[PDB]
Amino acid sequence: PIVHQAISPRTLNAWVKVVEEKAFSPEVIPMFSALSEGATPQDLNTMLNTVGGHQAAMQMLKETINEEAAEWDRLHPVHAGPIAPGQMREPRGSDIAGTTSTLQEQIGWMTHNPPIPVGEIYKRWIILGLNKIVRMYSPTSILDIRQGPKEPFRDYVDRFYKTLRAEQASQEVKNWMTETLLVQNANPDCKTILKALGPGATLEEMMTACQGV
Amino acid sequence: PIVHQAISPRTLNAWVKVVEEKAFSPEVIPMFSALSEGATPQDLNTMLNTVGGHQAAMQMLKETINEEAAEWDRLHPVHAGPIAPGQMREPRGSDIAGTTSTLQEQIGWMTHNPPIPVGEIYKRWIILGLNKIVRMYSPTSILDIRQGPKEPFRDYVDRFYKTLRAEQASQEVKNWMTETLLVQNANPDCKTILKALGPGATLEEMMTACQGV
Amino acid sequence: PIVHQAISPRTLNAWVKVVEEKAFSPEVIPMFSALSEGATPQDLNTMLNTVGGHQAAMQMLKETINEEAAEWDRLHPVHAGPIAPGQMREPRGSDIAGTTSTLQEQIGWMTHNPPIPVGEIYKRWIILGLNKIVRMYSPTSILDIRQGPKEPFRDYVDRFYKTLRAEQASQEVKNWMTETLLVQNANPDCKTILKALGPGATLEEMMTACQGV
Amino acid sequence: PIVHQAISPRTLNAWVKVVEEKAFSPEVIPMFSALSEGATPQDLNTMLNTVGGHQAAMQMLKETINEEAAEWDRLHPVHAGPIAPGQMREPRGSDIAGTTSTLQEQIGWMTHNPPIPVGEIYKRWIILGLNKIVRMYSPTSILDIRQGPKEPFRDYVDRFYKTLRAEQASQEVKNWMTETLLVQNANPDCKTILKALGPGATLEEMMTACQGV
Amino acid sequence: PIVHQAISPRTLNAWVKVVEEKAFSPEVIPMFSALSEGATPQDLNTMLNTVGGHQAAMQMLKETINEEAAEWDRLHPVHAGPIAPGQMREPRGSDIAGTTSTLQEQIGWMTHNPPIPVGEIYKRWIILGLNKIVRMYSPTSILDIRQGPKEPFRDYVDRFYKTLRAEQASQEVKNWMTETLLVQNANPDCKTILKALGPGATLEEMMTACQGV
Amino acid sequence: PIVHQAISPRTLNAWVKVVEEKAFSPEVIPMFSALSEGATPQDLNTMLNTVGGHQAAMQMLKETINEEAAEWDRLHPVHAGPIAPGQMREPRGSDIAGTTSTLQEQIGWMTHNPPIPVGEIYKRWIILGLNKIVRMYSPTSILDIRQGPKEPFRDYVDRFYKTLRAEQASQEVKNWMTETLLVQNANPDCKTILKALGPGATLEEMMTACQGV
C-alpha cells in the first residue's frame, strides 16, 4: 500500500482464505475493502490474481473495469505534450487499472499536491464489479422470501435481510421492499399481530411482538 | 483507526471469529469495543459489514443508529454558510454514521482543536444497539433463575449473574435484584443457611457458607 | 495500554483463551498480569468483560474492588475546589476502577509529574480479588496432601507445592508448612530415609534421596 | 528486502506453504511476486531454495535465468577499469542472479542515483521462468474446453478462463480465443441462445442469458 | 524486557507451550534464554509463574536462587547511608530475584553508567537451577549407553550425545567420555572397524565407516 | 540479531518446526540462513541449541566448527598487548563460535569501522557443517538414479535433480553429471527420442519431448 510499502503476507493470506470459505457472499466485499485500504493498483491486481478458481467472475470483473476505464478516458482525454520537469502526466484508464503504468507512476499520482488517487479510483471500479457478481451469484429474489408456517419470525427476518443485502436496487427501492414485503410475506398468525401495530412500528417492536408466536 | 491507519487483518479476523463462535453474548461487546479503539465511522461500518448472517440484528442496529442520528440532528441543527479556509463543517447524523461523509472529513473532525470525536460518538450509538440485541437475544429472565435441589450454589450464582448481565435494567434495579432475588430463589437447605448471616454478608461469605451443601 | 494505545487483538485473544483452558488456576494470574503491563482501568475492565461464564467469580471480584475503592476513599478524601488550568483532580475509588473517569482522565493521572498510577493501583485490587477466587476454587487443603504407598516422591512433591501455591497464607506460614508437612506426610519407607538427613537438607537432596524408592 | 532488512519468517513460511498446496498453479506467481516486493537477489534465491521437491521445474528455471543473464551480458558488456572511490561497478548476469555478487554489492546498486534495480530485474527473469513452468505443467489446451450437455454455463466459463489463464499466448491471441472459442464450444441449447445476442454482448449478459439453461 | 517494554503475548505463549510439550529437556533452556533476552527480574518471574504443574522443579529452582542470592549478599554487603539525589542503591539478592525491588528500581540498575545488569545476573541463577533440574530429570547415565547388536551406528550416536548433553560434568570430563566411552561401548562388529582408524579419527569418518554395518 | 535485538519467538519457533518436519533436507539450509540474517554467534548458537534429537549431526557440526576455528587461528594469530581505549581486540576461533566472547564483544566487532563480521563468519562455518550432514544423510547417489520403464520423464527429472542437489561435488562436476547422466540413464524409449535432439537441447525441450511418452 502507500506510505511504497509491500502488502503484508497476512493481508494476502487473509484475502485468499476469505474467498475460499465465503465465495462471493456480500461480506467478502467489505473484507476486500478493509484489506486494501491505501492500496495501489498493482496491490489491488495482486490481490485479484491470488484468487484461483472463480475465473468467470474475474472475467466479468475485468469487463466492468474496461467499461469504467473507457468512461474515464472519455471524460478525461489525454493531451499531447512533454511532461515538464517537476511534474506528472495525466493517467488513462489503463494506468488506473495498473496495466500501462509503473509502481512509481502510481506512487507519483497518489503522493502529490493535489493527489490524484488512482488507488481509490480503481478500487471504486473493482467494488463496482464485485457487487454485480455478488448480485449475480445470489440464487434467490427478495420477492420469493416467505415465512414458513412454523418458522420463528427472527429466522424469516434473517433470510429477508440477507437476500435484501444482495439485491440489485437503490435505497429508495430497498426502503420500499422493507416497507411492503416484510409484513406482506409473514405467515397469517404473525401477519395479523403486526398489522395491529401499524406501519409506524420498529423492527425491535415487530420482532418482540411475534416473539412467542 | 486514527493516527489514518488501516485496520489490521487480525483485528478484522478477530471480530469475524468472535461473532461466529459467540453470536450475541454479552462479552462480544467489550470485544467489539476493544477491537475498535480509535476507529473511524468507516472502520466501524467495515467491522459491521464483515458479519454475514445475523441480519435481523444488523437491521435493528441500523434503526437504533438512525434514531440516534435524528436525535443528534435535533440538538445540533446545521447552519447555512461557506466553510471558511482553515476550518471544518458541522457533522450531521449521517456524517457520524459514515454514510454522507468521507474518510478525510472523518479524519478532519477527529484531529482538531477542539476534537469532534465522531469515532467515539458513533461508537456510542453502535454499542447502544448491540445491548438492545444482546438483551433481546437473551432467552431467559432473572426472575426465572432458581437453584435446583441438588445444584451446587456456585453453579446457581454463575447462572444468576450471567442472566443478570444481559438484563434490561439500570444499576439501582440490578442492586435490587441482587439484594432480593439471589437469596430468595436459593433452595430451602442453603436458603436457611444464608438467612442466618443476614443481609450484610459478602458473596464470598455466602459462597463459602453454602459450599459443602 | 499507556504510551494511549489500543490493546492488541492477540493480547485480548490470549486472555480469553487462558481462562477457557485453565479457569482459575494460579498461573492464570501471572498471565493476567503479563498481558496487562501498562494497562489503563478501561483496558483492565475490557479484559475482565471479555470473559463469559465464571460470573460468580467476577461478582466476588467486583465486591473486592468495591471494598478496596471504599478503603482508598477513606484514606484519600476528595476536597471541593475548581481544578485549576494546567492541573488534574484527585481520583476516587470509582475513577480508579474506571466507572466514573474517562480515558483522558486516566491518561491524565498516569502521565504527569508526579505520576498517579491508577493503572497499577487498580491492577493491585484486581489481582487481590483473583487470589481470593483462586484460593476459593482450589478444591483441596495442604493438610490433606499425603504420599501414597507406591507414589514416586517427585509426584507427591508436585502435588504438595501445587496445593501450597493456592493456599491462603503468608510466607512465614508457608515456610512452616514446608518445614513441617512435607516430611511429616511422606510414606513410611521414604519418611525414614529423609529423617536420616535431618532438617538441613535441600529439596534437591531430598528428591534425589527418595529417588529409587 | 531493501530498506537491508531480513526477510520475515512468515513471508518465508507463506512462500513454502503456497507451493505445497498449489504447486504451479497460475495464482502462485502473483503470490510469489507479492511476497518478494523489494527483494534482493539473495532474498529471491533464498525463496527459491526453500522449495523442496519440484526440482525439474527449478532446473528449467535456472536455464531460463542463464539465458536471460547471457542476454543481459550481450547488451551490457563490462568495461575494464578501476572502480573509482564513491562509485559502483557494472553488474553482470551472474551478479543479477546473485551468484557473483555480495549483499552489499546488491544493496549498492539498488540504492543509488540512478538506481540500478537488480532486485526488480532478476525478479523479471524469475517470473518469466515461472510462467513457462506454469504453462508447461498445465495439462489441457483451450481448444479442448467444451461445455457438457448438462453443464451449467457458469462452470464451463470457469474452466474456459482457467485454462486460458495458463495458455502460452499474447493478448491479441487471447482476445481472439475469447471471441471465437467461448461461443463456438458451448452446447447446442445455449449456443443457440447466445448467437441470438450477437458478438457485441457482455459476459454478464451471456452468463445471465444461459443462466436457467 | 528493557528499552521498559511489556513482554509480548507470543513470547509468553511460546514459553508456556515449550514446557507443555518438552518438559525439562535440555533444549528448553536455550529456548528459555532466547525468549528472555533483555528481560527484567519481574519479566523472568512472570515467565516462571506462568508454568503450571512441575512445581517440585520450581521449588528446587527457588532454593537454588536463594543460595545464589545469599552468595551475592556475602560478596556484596549493603552499606547504611542515604541514597543521594541522582544516584541508585546497591541491590540485594532479593532485589535481584525481584522480591524486594520495584520495576523502576530494576529499570534503574540496568540503565545507568555503569550498568548493574540485574536481568542478566538473575538470569544466570535461573539457568543454573534449570540445568540441575534437567540433569536430575534425565533418566539415564552416559555409562549405560550401549550400541545394540543390530542398531545403526547413527542411532547409537544420537543416544550417546543426547544423554551426554544432559550429564553433570565439566568440559574436560565430557571430552573424556567422548574419547573413552563412544568407541568402548560400540557393538563388536563396528567396535573392530573403528579401532582400525585409531583415536585421531573424526566423528564424520567414524559414522561413515560404520555406515553400512 | 544486530541493530542488539532479541531474536523473535516466531523466528525461533520457525527454526524448530523446520527441523522436526524436514530433518536435514537440503532446503532446511536456506531456511536456516534466512532465519539467521544479521544474527550474532550467540543467536546462531541459540538456534542450534533449540534442536533436540539429531545430536550426532550436531556433534559433527561442532567438529567442523572446531576445525574452522583452528584454521582461523592459524591465519590470524593473536598478538599480546593492552587493548587501547577506543579500540577492540582481535577475535579467536572460540570468540567467533561464541564460546569465549560476550554479547558486547560480538556487538563490538560487528559494528565498527571496519566491521569484523563474526556473525557472517561463523555463519559460514555453520552452513559448511550443515552441507556435510545433508550430504551424509542423503541415502542415494546420483549414479543410482535411473528412469523406470513406465516412469513419467518429469518424475525422473525430479528425482535426478533432488539427489543432485545433495551431492558432494563442485559445479564443474555437477555440470558434467547433468551433461552425462541425465540422458544416459533415461529408459530406452525416451533415451532414443532425446538423442535425436542432440546435446544442445534445453531441459524445457527435453521435458516437452518425452512428455507424451
Ligand SMILES: Cc1[nH]c2ccccc2c1CC(=O)N[C@@H](Cc1ccccc1)C(=O)N(C)c1ccccc1
Ligand atoms: C449488512 C447490510 N444488509 C443490508 C441490506 C440492505 C441494504 C444494505 C445492507 C447492508 C450494508 C450496510 O448498510 N452497511 C452499513 C454498515 C452497517 C452494517 C450493519 C449494521 C449497521 C450498519 C453501511 O455500510 N453504512 C454506510 C451505513 C451506516 C449506518 C447506517 C446505514 C448505512
Ligand SMILES: Cc1[nH]c2ccccc2c1CC(=O)N[C@@H](Cc1ccccc1)C(=O)N(C)c1ccccc1
Ligand atoms: C461481567 C458483568 N456481569 C454483570 C452483571 C450485571 C451488571 C453488569 C455486569 C458485568 C459488566 C461489568 O460490570 N463490568 C465491569 C468490569 C468488571 C468485570 C468483571 C469483574 C470486575 C469488573 C465494568 O465494566 N466496570 C466499569 C466496572 C468496574 C469496576 C466495578 C464495577 C463496574
Ligand SMILES: Cc1[nH]c2ccccc2c1CC(=O)N[C@@H](Cc1ccccc1)C(=O)N(C)c1ccccc1
Ligand atoms: C509457582 C509458585 N509456587 C508457590 C508455592 C508457594 C508459594 C508461592 C508459590 C509460587 C509463586 C512464586 O513464588 N513465584 C516466584 C517466581 C518463581 C516461580 C517459580 C520458580 C522460581 C521463581 C515469585 O513470584 N517471586 C517474586 C520470587 C522470586 C524468587 C524467589 C522467590 C519468589
Ligand SMILES: Cc1[nH]c2ccccc2c1CC(=O)N[C@@H](Cc1ccccc1)C(=O)N(C)c1ccccc1
Ligand atoms: C486471473 C486471470 N485470468 C486470465 C486469463 C487470461 C489472461 C490473463 C488472465 C488473468 C490475469 C490478469 O489479467 N490479471 C489482471 C488483474 C485482475 C485479475 C482478476 C480480475 C480483474 C483484474 C492484471 O494483472 N492486470 C494487469 C489487469 C488489470 C486490469 C485489467 C486487465 C488486466
Ligand SMILES: Cc1[nH]c2ccccc2c1CC(=O)N[C@@H](Cc1ccccc1)C(=O)N(C)c1ccccc1
Ligand atoms: C547440543 C549439545 N549437546 C551437547 C553434548 C555435550 C555437551 C554440550 C552439548 C550441547 C550444547 C552446546 O555445546 N551448544 C553449543 C552450540 C552448538 C549446538 C549444536 C551444534 C553446534 C553448536 C554452544 O552453546 N556453544 C557455546 C558452542 C559453540 C561452538 C562450539 C562449541 C560450543
Ligand SMILES: Cc1[nH]c2ccccc2c1CC(=O)N[C@@H](Cc1ccccc1)C(=O)N(C)c1ccccc1
Ligand atoms: C535447488 C537446487 N538444486 C540443485 C541441484 C544441483 C546444484 C544446486 C542446486 C540447487 C541450489 C541452487 O542452485 N540455488 C540457486 C537459487 C535457485 C534455486 C532454484 C531455482 C533457481 C535458482 C542459487 O542459490 N543460486 C546462487 C543461483 C542463482 C541463479 C542461478 C544459479 C544459482
Ligand SMILES: [Cl-]
Ligand atoms: Cl497473473
Ligand SMILES: [Cl-]
Ligand atoms: Cl483484457
Ligand SMILES: [Cl-]
Ligand atoms: Cl456492504
Ligand SMILES: [Cl-]
Ligand atoms: Cl438505512
Ligand SMILES: [Cl-]
Ligand atoms: Cl460489559
Ligand SMILES: [Cl-]
Ligand atoms: Cl457494582
Ligand SMILES: [Cl-]
Ligand atoms: Cl541451497
Ligand SMILES: [Cl-]
Ligand atoms: Cl547453473
Ligand SMILES: [Cl-]
Ligand atoms: Cl504467582
Ligand SMILES: [Cl-]
Ligand atoms: Cl521462598
